[PDB]
Design an enzyme around this catalytic site. Structure first.
Site, PDB file in Angstrom:
ATOM      1  N   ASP B  25      -2.324  -5.998  -5.232  1.00 32.13           N
ATOM      2  CA  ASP B  25      -2.088  -4.587  -4.983  1.00 32.13           C
ATOM      3  C   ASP B  25      -0.628  -4.214  -5.099  1.00 32.13           C
ATOM      4  O   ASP B  25       0.164  -4.334  -4.152  1.00 32.13           O
ATOM      5  CB  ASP B  25      -2.633  -4.283  -3.593  1.00 32.13           C
ATOM      6  CG  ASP B  25      -2.567  -2.860  -3.276  1.00 32.13           C
ATOM      7  OD1 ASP B  25      -2.145  -2.027  -4.056  1.00 32.13           O
ATOM      8  OD2 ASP B  25      -2.845  -2.411  -2.127  1.00 32.13           O
ATOM      9  N   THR B  26      -0.191  -3.720  -6.259  1.00 31.48           N
ATOM     10  CA  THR B  26       1.127  -3.306  -6.494  1.00 31.48           C
ATOM     11  C   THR B  26       1.572  -2.102  -5.679  1.00 31.48           C
ATOM     12  O   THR B  26       2.778  -1.888  -5.533  1.00 31.48           O
ATOM     13  CB  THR B  26       1.409  -3.090  -7.989  1.00 31.48           C
ATOM     14  OG1 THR B  26       0.545  -2.060  -8.465  1.00 31.48           O
ATOM     15  CG2 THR B  26       1.166  -4.345  -8.800  1.00 31.48           C
ATOM     16  N   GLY B  27       0.619  -1.326  -5.184  1.00 33.42           N
ATOM     17  CA  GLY B  27       0.885  -0.201  -4.321  1.00 33.42           C
ATOM     18  C   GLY B  27       0.998  -0.530  -2.850  1.00 33.42           C
ATOM     19  O   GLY B  27       1.131   0.414  -2.044  1.00 33.42           O
TER      20      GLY B  27
END
Lengths: 6, 99, 99
Positions: B25-27
């Site tokens: 999850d880059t967010g």
């Protein structure tokens, strides 16, 4: 801290 | 590996000797895993996202194996809808976005 | 291009002709923008994440250019602290995770 959508 | 995004980027991790599924999850600033015990000390923390804030347990210096790549860092434990591997550990395994 | 994850992966997008900052988010199914005053038809939707659910407006077939790469699809509008580009558009620009 911010942490993301379903 | 190279992972496309037509489906959620779910992978298997190992934590505390157990296998789990988690989303790359880059967010996410942080790594957040559903309720469980992990070894050692923890302290309360609050984190936010899309719906607002939740309370979690902050465990530091936790080894996590992420699709065979090692990381050691903070793991937050609490009522997340899905297990997520955030940037704190994605950076350790060398993950980038590419287009 | 290649984007590392030392900081939040914020990039320039264009939506309705206007430049905005948004997070490239592999943990997002959907694209969530706070652009409360687009023209056009929308329908109500609810979306969730770590804190629970929020109400959003669903707009279809909206052009969204991400770092010069054009995309077009569904954009959800609602109160979010960060604009997020989710997998519905990331796939259109050929974005992958790599490690």
């Amino acid at each position: 801290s911010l942490n993301x959508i379903x | 590996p190279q992972i496309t995004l037509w489906k959620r980027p779910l992978v298997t991790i190992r934590i505390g000797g157990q296998l789990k599924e988690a989303l790359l999850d880059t967010g996410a600033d942080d790594t957040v895993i559903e309720e469980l015990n992990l070894p050692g000390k923890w302290k309360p923390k609050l984190i936010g996202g899309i719906g607002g804030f939740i309370k979690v347990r902050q465990y530091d210096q936790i080894p996590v194996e992420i699709a065979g790549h090692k990381a050691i860092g903070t793991v937050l434990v609490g009522p997340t809808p899905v297990n997520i591997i955030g940037r704190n550990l994605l950076t350790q395994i060398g993950a980038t976005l590419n287009f």
